[PDB]
Design a protein around this nucleic acid. Structure first.
Lengths: 785, 36, 73
RNA sequence: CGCAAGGCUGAAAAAUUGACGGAAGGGCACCACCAGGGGUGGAGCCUGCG
RNA sequence: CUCUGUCGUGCUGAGGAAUCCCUAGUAAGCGCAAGUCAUCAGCUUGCGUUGAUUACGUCCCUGCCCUUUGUACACACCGCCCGUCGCUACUACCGAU
């Protein structure tokens, strides 16, 4: 019951996620690991890879005033801080809900602003490891952040927001694009200007200067427009010279110069690249007179261009350690030392033990690859209908044969003896090539999606588009049987080492196990959330497990199954794209899995409540009156130092706090709580009622609990002494408040009577005739009995 | 018996007598006795 | 919010004379939001609030009674 | 008497109305608190249940 | 059961931890009668007699039910309860075919 573990992972330079950094090293993002290359020699320096995390990394930032510390933002919402000296994560920050997308650092590097796709921007302290605060604007996702202190951000709702940081609320907003979306932000390093790139190819230009009045900081000084009308991915400024680079996700990067805003900014140069660039970045090398623009493409490459300031040359490139588009097939050697990977545009064969590429060929499209025994030559069936043949040791192309006319070779299987190969195509036929010379063909009803042989070369099995499988005999091609019951067409199949089992992977999201004597389905087992691409048995039963098989599907999963006990024994995660191909070793000890990820991998009490609030307010009143006496003596520094509950509730007055704790309780509970209150607690309540009536708020509640206090303690008040003083104060204050409120409402009702009579006088009638029958609210009021 | 209970609960049909209005005769529409 | 509505209504009536508020003519005066029904609603709710505060004052003379008893002692 | 009575087959959804909670406030209870009382449980007999 | 006499503690010992039940003609004692198409003589069900202590409060503990929508209108009072997701509509993004 031996499981599988990730041991190796390779075949990848920069992913389609954003944010390349330069340091003469290029620090880019592979899927979950952030890896740093030399650009001069193609050997990577290091990889930063964490065992606790699996989510993909999508934002990189270099700290200023201290390189060899970096901030990476992942897909789950976490941030890690790495070192380039030692490849560990010193601190981790789990603050956001989803998908960190833009990082930013302070000038001093003690403060870190991270804006997500869940639209929160959270700023982080780097000496206390506490989430400082959470700035909250922005209808949808934030696409630009910068530290000006002050913060300047821009979001996908086309708003630039200028936030303060001493008082954590926004000072300014402006709307960059009227009906579009502001997509990128670029700040001048001296904070004089900011240009924001919008959806139409329009670049808006803003000038920056360096509360009760009209505050005006950002000014739309003009609009610019670039050449290509795409959603612009980034705007990067030169840290030293007067240039910037604007690019969308396309094959052009437009470098403009800093000398109307159209007179201020002119395009210096337009750089064409061989692939769609995802993120450009700037590089300045010590001792050169140039501009080292480092582009990182979506098509799996880094390019360093030299731009002459006062044309482009493809100066440096990193393409050897990765396939450039997308791996469609893998086929690993009989000696299991090297493997071949077949991608659209290329063949690249690799060593397992060193995980470094050895040979490279160019083909048009590469559906299916498999080498011939002796591992000297390889076979590739392409989309255009042909079968190409290459060889490893001399690294060349031997032969090419138009197998089918324009119909893609969907299946290639080498004979287990090793003298023939079979190509099943997108035409109806499936052809046999003996070595290569065409020996026998097989015409069948529909397009053959996948065919495989038997390990003892006895029976063949094609798998059509008609959602069916035809198992034939190998010697003469007579129909042995056919397997049915698939709702959607069969994508793959693999049959057992003794030919007593077939697994059959379909597009209806399940795999089937057939017995291959009588072809009875053993058990249809629904095991994947999407259409299962491929299946493979481990070939050797030397280890006692030959009836186990792997299945790889579009839901980013491999699954290790047991066909004897019909049970999933392991679930293999770790791929971030739809896994297209996989293969197992001939020893079966490891397997390779090649994805849409472009990374091929190798696997081995109410009254007591108001009473304590009364006491809190009483201590607050004593501290405030002592602070009044101190500030009356001298204007020296005197802190009141009130309760942390008050400075956490927000420096409210004790009157407001005790009013809220009297307001929260329902009226019957208020009656019971004031009844349960003792006469030691009564005088504090009477002082706070004096405070309410002085600073009038909830006068009916104040009078209600005051008359309840007097009526439930009338004898004790008229026997005590200090109640005379505080009750005289509350009498004067309450009588003034009641007389003020009553006189205001009396003036209101008298004025409403006067204006109502005047409006009646306006309304009465104009004409006079014989019929004064022209000169009332009515309600309905149903009642059941 | 347990499977009978599960079938009735799932495709829920219960034989409890239901609370009827006491004035279904004179007030069959069930109007509300307030503002109209 | 009755006290804050009564206070800014007091400021409104003390600022503008009665003839302006009677000859107030605004294009959005139709049905339930015309000037008659608006001033009627304001007047009747102010009548209720005034009745409440009058009951409160009459009940609030208890404090003068208690202070008179303590003056007697 | 006629139809029912021909096996892509081989046992283990709905939703603008839905899924699950939390906090506050009520009502009730010898399956709760409070005050007491009484069984059973110790010896022997035996119905019954396992 | 009440009253009156004769003798006087003498293998001639009122049930542990737990667990359950009980608030007025109730707990508990006592006998008499019947044997009703199921059950019940190793008992069942009636019937009379004698008849207390202690609660009769509170949601503090353990829970159970329910409000936060409706179901009526005056007085009067209250004053937008909170979270994690789904579903629907629209908007733009990502990358293979």
């Amino acid at each position: 019951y031996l499981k599988f573990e990730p041991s190796k992972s390779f075949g990848v330079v920069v992913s389609s996620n954003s944010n390349l950094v330069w340091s003469g090293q290029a620090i880019v993002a592979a899927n979950e690991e952030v890896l740093v290359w030399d650009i001069k020699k193609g050997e990577l320096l290091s990889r930063w890879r964490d065992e606790n995390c699996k989510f993909r990394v999508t934002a990189i930032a270099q700290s200023r005033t201290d390189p060899d510390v970096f901030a990476v933002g992942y897909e789950d919402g976490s941030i890690r801080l790495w070192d380039s000296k030692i490849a560990t994560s010193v601190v981790s920050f789990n603050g956001h809900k989803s998908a960190i997308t833009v990082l930013a650092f302070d000038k001093t590097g003690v403060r870190l602003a991270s804006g997500s796709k869940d639209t929160d921007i959270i700023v982080w302290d780097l000496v206390a490891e506490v989430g400082q605060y959470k700035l909250r604007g922005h209808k949808d996702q934030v696409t630009g952040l910068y530290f000006i202190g002050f913060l300047l951000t821009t979001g996908k709702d086309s708003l630039i927001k200028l936030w303060d940081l001493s008082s954590r609320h926004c000072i300014e907003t402006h709307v960059a694009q009227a009906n579009g979306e502001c997509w990128a932000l670029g700040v001048s390093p001296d904070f004089t200007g900011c240009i924001t790139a919008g959806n139409d190819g329009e670049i808006t230009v803003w000038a920056l200067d360096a509360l009760s009045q009209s505050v005006n900081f950002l000014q739309n000084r003009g609009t610019l427009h670039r050449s290509s009308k795409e959603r612009a991915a980034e705007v990067v400024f030169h840290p030293l010279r007067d240039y910037f680079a604007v690019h969308g996700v396309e094959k052009s990067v437009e470098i403009w110069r800093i000398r109307e805003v159209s007179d201020v900014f002119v395009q210096h140069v337009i750089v064409r690249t061989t692939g769609k660039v995802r993120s450009v970045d700037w590089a300045l090398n010590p001792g050169v007179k140039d501009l080292q623009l480092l582009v990182g493409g979506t098509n799996n490459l880094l390019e360093l261009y030299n731009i002459v300031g006062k044309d482009y040359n493809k100066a440096l490139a990193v393409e050897l350690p990765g396939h450039r588009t997308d791996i469609r097939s893998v086929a690993i050697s009989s000696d299991d030392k090297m493997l071949a990977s077949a991608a659209n545009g290329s063949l690249k064969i690799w060593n397992i033990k060193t995980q470094q590429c050895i040979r490279t060929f160019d083909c048009g499209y590469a559906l299916c690859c498999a080498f011939l025994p002796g591992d000297k030559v390889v076979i590739v069936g392409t989309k255009e209908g042909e079968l190409q043949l290459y060889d490893v040791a001399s690294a060349s192309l031997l032969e090419t044969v138009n197998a089918h006319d324009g119909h893609a070779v969907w299946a290639l299987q080498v004979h287990p003896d090793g003298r023939s190969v079979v190509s099943g195509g997108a035409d109806k036929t499936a052809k046999f090539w003996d070595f290569l010379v065409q020996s026998r063909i097989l015409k069948v009803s529909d397009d053959i999606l996948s065919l495989r042989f038997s390990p003892d070369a006895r029976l063949l099995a094609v798998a059509l588009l008609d959602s069916t499988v035809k198992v034939f005999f190998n010697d003469t091609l007579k129909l042995y049987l056919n397997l049915y019951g698939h709702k959607l067409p069969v994508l793959s199949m693999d049959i057992s080492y003794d030919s007593k089992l077939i697994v059959t992977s379909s597009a209806d999201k399940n795999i089937r196990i057939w017995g291959l004597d009588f072809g009875d389905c053993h058990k249809a087992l629904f095991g994947h959330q999407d259409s299962i691409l491929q299946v493979a048995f481990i070939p050797h039963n030397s280890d006692g497990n030959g009836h186990y098989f792997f299945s790889a599907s579009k839901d980013r999963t491999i699954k290790y199954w047991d066909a004897d006990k019909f049970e999933q024994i392991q679930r293999i995660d770790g791929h971030h794209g739809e896994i297209w191909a996989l293969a197992v070793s001939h020893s079966g000890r490891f397997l390779v899995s090649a994805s849409h990820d472009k990374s091929i991998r190798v696997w081995e009490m109410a009254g007591e409540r108001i009473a304590e609030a009364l006491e809190l307010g009483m201590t607050d009143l004593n501290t405030i009156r002592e602070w009044e006496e101190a500030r009356q003596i001298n204007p020296n520094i005197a802190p009141p130092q009130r309760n942390p509950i008050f400075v956490a509730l927000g420096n409210i007055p004790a009157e407001t706090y005790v009013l809220n704790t009297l307001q929260k309780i329902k009226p019957a509970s208020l009656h019971d709580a004031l009844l349960v209150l003792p006469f030691s607690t009564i005088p504090s309540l009477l002082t706070f009622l004096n405070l309410f009536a002085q600073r009038e708020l909830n006068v009916p509640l104040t009078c209600r609990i005051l008359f309840f206090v007097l009526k439930t303690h009338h004898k004790q008040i008229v026997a005590s002494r200090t109640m005379r003083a505080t009750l005289e104060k509350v009498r004067a204050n309450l009588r003034a408040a009641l007389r003020r409120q009553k006189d205001e409402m009396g003036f209101n009702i008298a004025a409403l009577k006067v204006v109502s009579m005047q409006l009646r006088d306006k309304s009465v009638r104009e004409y006079v005739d014989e019929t004064w029958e022209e000169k009332v609210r009515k309600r309905a009021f149903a009642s059941l009995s | 018996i347990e499977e009978l209970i599960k079938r009735r609960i799932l495709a829920g049909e219960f034989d409890e007598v239901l609370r009827r209005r006491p004035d279904m005769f004179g007030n069959p529409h069930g109007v509300r006795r307030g503002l109209v | 919010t009755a006290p804050v509505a009564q206070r800014v209504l007091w400021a409104l009536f003390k600022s503008h004379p009665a003839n302006k508020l009677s000859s107030l003519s605004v294009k959005g005066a139709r049905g339930h939001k015309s000037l008659n029904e608006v001033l009627d609603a304001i007047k009747v709710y102010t009548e209720r609030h005034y009745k409440r505060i009058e009951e409160l004052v009459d009940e609030s003379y208890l404090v003068e009674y208690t202070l008179r008893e303590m003056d007697a002692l």
